[PDB]
Design a protein around this ligand. Sequence first.
Ligand code: NAP
Ligand code: NAP
Ligand code: NAP
Ligand code: NAP
Ligand code: EUB
Ligand code: EUB
Ligand code: EUB
Ligand code: EUB
Lengths: 251, 250, 251, 249
Amino acid sequence: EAPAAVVTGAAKRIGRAIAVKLHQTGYRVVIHYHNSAEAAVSLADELNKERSNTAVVCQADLTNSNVLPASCEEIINSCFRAFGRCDVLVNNASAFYPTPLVQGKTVETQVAELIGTNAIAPFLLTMSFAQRQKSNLSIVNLCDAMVDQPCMAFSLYNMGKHALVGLTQSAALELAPYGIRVNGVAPGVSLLPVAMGEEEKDKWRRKVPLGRREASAEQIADAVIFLVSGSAQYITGSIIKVDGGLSLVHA
Amino acid sequence: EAPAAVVTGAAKRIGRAIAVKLHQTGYRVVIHYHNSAEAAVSLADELNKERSNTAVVCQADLTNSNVLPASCEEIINSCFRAFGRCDVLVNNASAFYPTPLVQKTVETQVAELIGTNAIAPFLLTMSFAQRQSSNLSIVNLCDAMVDQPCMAFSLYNMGKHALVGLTQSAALELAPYGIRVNGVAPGVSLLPVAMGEEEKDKWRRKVPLGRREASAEQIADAVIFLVSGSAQYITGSIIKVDGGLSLVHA
Amino acid sequence: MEAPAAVVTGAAKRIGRAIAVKLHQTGYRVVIHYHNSAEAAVSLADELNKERSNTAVVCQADLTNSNVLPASCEEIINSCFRAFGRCDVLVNNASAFYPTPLVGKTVETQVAELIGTNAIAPFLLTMSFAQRQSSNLSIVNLCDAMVDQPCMAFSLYNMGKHALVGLTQSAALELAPYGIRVNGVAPGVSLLPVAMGEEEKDKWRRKVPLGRREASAEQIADAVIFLVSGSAQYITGSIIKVDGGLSLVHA
Amino acid sequence: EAPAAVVTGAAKRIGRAIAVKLHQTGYRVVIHYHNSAEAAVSLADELNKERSNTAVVCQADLTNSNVLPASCEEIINSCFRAFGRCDVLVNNASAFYPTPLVGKTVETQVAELIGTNAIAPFLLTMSFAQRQSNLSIVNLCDAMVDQPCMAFSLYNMGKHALVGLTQSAALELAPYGIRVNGVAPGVSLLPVAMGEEEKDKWRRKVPLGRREASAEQIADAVIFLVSGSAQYITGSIIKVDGGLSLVHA
Ligand SMILES: NC(=O)c1ccc[n+]([C@@H]2O[C@H](COP(=O)([O-])OP(=O)(O)OC[C@H]3O[C@@H](n4cnc5c(N)ncnc54)[C@H](OP(=O)(O)O)[C@@H]3O)[C@@H](O)[C@H]2O)c1
Ligand SMILES: NC(=O)c1ccc[n+]([C@@H]2O[C@H](COP(=O)([O-])OP(=O)(O)OC[C@H]3O[C@@H](n4cnc5c(N)ncnc54)[C@H](OP(=O)(O)O)[C@@H]3O)[C@@H](O)[C@H]2O)c1
Ligand SMILES: NC(=O)c1ccc[n+]([C@@H]2O[C@H](COP(=O)([O-])OP(=O)(O)OC[C@H]3O[C@@H](n4cnc5c(N)ncnc54)[C@H](OP(=O)(O)O)[C@@H]3O)[C@@H](O)[C@H]2O)c1
Ligand SMILES: NC(=O)c1ccc[n+]([C@@H]2O[C@H](COP(=O)([O-])OP(=O)(O)OC[C@H]3O[C@@H](n4cnc5c(N)ncnc54)[C@H](OP(=O)(O)O)[C@@H]3O)[C@@H](O)[C@H]2O)c1
Ligand SMILES: N#Cc1ccc(COc2ccc3nc(N)sc3c2)cc1
Ligand SMILES: N#Cc1ccc(COc2ccc3nc(N)sc3c2)cc1
Ligand SMILES: N#Cc1ccc(COc2ccc3nc(N)sc3c2)cc1
Ligand SMILES: N#Cc1ccc(COc2ccc3nc(N)sc3c2)cc1
């Protein structure tokens, strides 16, 4: 039988790219989404049209709350209900916005969203993935190559991505005896925010030593693909930067 | 006249050592506590006998909840009330226990481990900075074993990693205000009181420098260094005080 | 002549051999550099030339730091151009590894050997490779996942490996404008020293979370193959730990 | 009774400020120098005036060669000759200049940059440790080591190796009671050769005060690491960079 993978925030962008690429590699996929109903279903359609019964959608808010554990438990349940297995979990879903330290959302909403999506939901999804296990099991977390050179006023987001590095190492150590590898893919600049203007986009592009451009979503997916593959069978607790040398450029 | 410092979880162990050493260096201090009122008051009394009206206590739960921002705002407010200023914030308070991935509700554990170790320090940081010549700085109590974590301590580990991220981000963001932001990262200092004595010796014997844990005062020394005029260009730095423990391979 | 060409240093045995083999299996013509192991280097070349004619040469050079090291490194790179008309890939694999405690070989020889092979020779090879430059040009340095938790009394080895991390980062930055990518593979415990007793080998094996075993040479080679591939074309300045979680294990 | 310290490249700039501050703290100092003879003897005068018999100079070229071990051995020897002890070693001496991947031979470039920045520190560390209370070594590392300057590969390689040494020697020498630590400046006293527009360019990058570190600010970290207040600190590198290493492209 074909292996099965969960991709969080899979409706668009990097998540979609990962889902698609895992699909073309022969995975059945759970397209998790939050607000992107249209894009999620539309992607699952495209995928099923290619090989029938290979894609499902799973809606979940991944903001931290007392129900997040059940929501994460359910996401993994959705893989097992659809496919009888869960071989790969990609923690791709991410909230990303400034939270300036010196002063819309309450700060507790901000904490719930930025730490929730970026770290707490991956932790809970990992617990659920690991516990539901009865092959090549792995977890890939979408980290950030710029964690130690953070953007001004993104403290909560930065905190969550650091926590995610924390989890990747802690989970790799813990889940290694169960044969579950846990690794990271750290984009520098990939697909820029939809909201971002071209002039600003180019400001970021010009910083990238390797070709003065952002990563395509497929280039990110490539590293994900490598990590879940048999070519990475001994790789655990490793974070592969996919950043064109961005994190190496001094101020 | 004298600078003032907040130390969270300052009733016992490392926070106590930090509070004392700060006071010995001439700081007025807020001794924050959650459960340890008796110990907190005892410390304040001891320091006030040395210098009158130089130590105050302040109760707060630093677990993450909808009231944590108010609590943290109050911790900082209590320093400005007592002393008319807040020059130092030491984020020492920390919940610490294992949270296995394969098995208190996990969300309590989250609120406690991430709350104390990362969220409350972020909010305290905010309130500290909002309320602002001077030598303003923040010291965050990190963990030197963060990249070699203990088995089944994922949430603790995530919270400390988050604290490393806050150190860095706040150092950048607050540098234009002259607020320095730094970390001290113990390896093995005072062991958890609940831990078995043999389990303590195992940890002690692993330390390259003297096969013993750091005393609390040794941790406090790094903190004292970081808040001083001797560290006025230092921001975004985390100083390991671990006797080389983080350098020892499996 | 449309086939790409790779230089692998210390390619005669163990990890570099597996890398030469895997590169060859990928469609690379290979320069098999060696120092002492002439017989093994030639028999690799022969085995590879049996598979495809005129796709493997050998190149002898001592990689010890000396006045002639720069000429030697230039020759190694030239040899690839003379054999195959191109040089697409450099794999800095060769390494001396022995203790140099702080408290028949002189310390200066120890320096020349451990720093020469592990750092200087990679720097000069890098320089010659770049000076000489559809194309996908990259360098892969064989680092060490344990550089921040070093073995007792291996300071010079450790120092050369750390220097290699520096080169990887510095060369990635410098060579990104030429479209030369520069990455590391960092093994933990891989193919253990040839004579080392199985009781002692098991002490290292038991430390690894993922399977309580060392990496095969082929597993290290897998990460090298990924880094040189079309799948890694935005990856530069990255070091991929291939260590089975070994770096994550506390004392 | 008074402890003794070796500082390499102590005639000028950061080395000088380390020597000055160690002296003020109560150390006898060996002022190692290579070319800066006048400034070295001049510093030892200033120090010796202040407390006689507390400063010597020691000349050595710290470029890698077959004789570098004997020169490093000599530098430590000259501390024991003058003062009967050697409590502190400060690895400050550094070559620093571009070596692009694409006036000196590359073999000289290697010998200088890897010699001064890494090999001489290793050899000095060896000799220091061989001759053996609060014993320690401080290495002058670099906070920009993972965000290197363009075309400084050899220099960066040496500072990377220095981190390696700091860690490996900290581990190895800890059972002897010798601690080994690093101080990593970002932008401190900018190279003399550099023009003033370029200096200001670098100044503007520093989040904390938009200025370089004084040599005294760097020396303060060295002072802390050698002091009683750092007795459990080994294998730590303290960035003294005003938050520069935190600034993205
Ligand atoms: N793009 C880059 O340049 C870049 C750079 C560095 C790191 N990364 C990392 O790479 C990963 C993918 O990047 P990306 O730009 O493709 O991500 P993105 O488009 O900004 O967001 C990914 C998806 O996460 C889901 N999400 C957001 N908030 C959520 C919440 N509260 N609950 C549940 N789901 C939520 C969204 O799903 P719906 O659309 O269904 O609501 C969203 O489409 C992320 O983890 C990111 O942090 C990306
Ligand atoms: N001890 C070590 O070896 C070691 C190693 C690595 C890192 N560290 C770091 O060093 C720092 C201090 O260490 P320590 O051993 O002194 O830690 P500890 O005794 O375990 O710290 C607990 C202190 O923080 C307060 N605290 C705990 N949970 C809290 C909550 N939910 N809300 C509010 N306050 C809470 C406590 O206050 P009350 O008693 O008043 O309730 C207590 O005084 C910590 O940040 C720790 O992570 C220590
Ligand atoms: N194996 C592991 O467990 C492990 C762990 C961490 C890192 N690594 C890294 O992975 C790489 C390959 O590992 P390995 O175990 O296969 O390495 P290795 O067997 O120790 O050495 C590989 C080759 O390096 C060459 N070499 C040694 N000294 C030399 C000199 N002075 N001049 C020129 N060549 C010299 C030798 O060539 P000849 O035999 O032809 O003389 C040797 O066969 C190394 O860079 C190593 O540091 C390996
Ligand atoms: N300045 C900064 O902004 C900065 C930033 C990051 C790191 N650092 C590090 O901090 C330390 C001190 O900085 P600095 O600017 O004061 O250093 P520097 O002035 O550039 O050099 C210090 C001394 O090193 C000695 N030296 C150079 N080549 C030598 C050789 N071949 N043999 C023996 N000695 C040699 C010279 O001594 P003589 O004059 O006696 O010949 C020189 O005065 C260095 O390790 C440096 O890499 C400095
Ligand atoms: N303002 C602003 C700004 C600054 C830097 C970036 C870099 O691109 C990123 C970085 C992280 C990140 N995380 C997501 N979930 S999307 C994204 C884009 C994007 C936006
Ligand atoms: N099991 C286990 C175990 C392993 C290592 C340690 C080291 O000591 C620490 C570490 C973190 C920490 N955080 C606190 N709030 S107390 C404490 C003690 C303590 C317990
Ligand atoms: N003492 C000791 C000791 C430490 C680590 C290992 C793991 O195997 C390695 C590590 C690095 C290394 N470098 C080479 N050129 S071979 C090799 C084997 C083997 C022995
Ligand atoms: N080109 C160029 C250039 C870029 C940045 C700097 C920063 O200042 C430093 C850094 C390292 C260093 N090492 C020395 N031995 S002096 C020195 C000055 C100095 C020069």
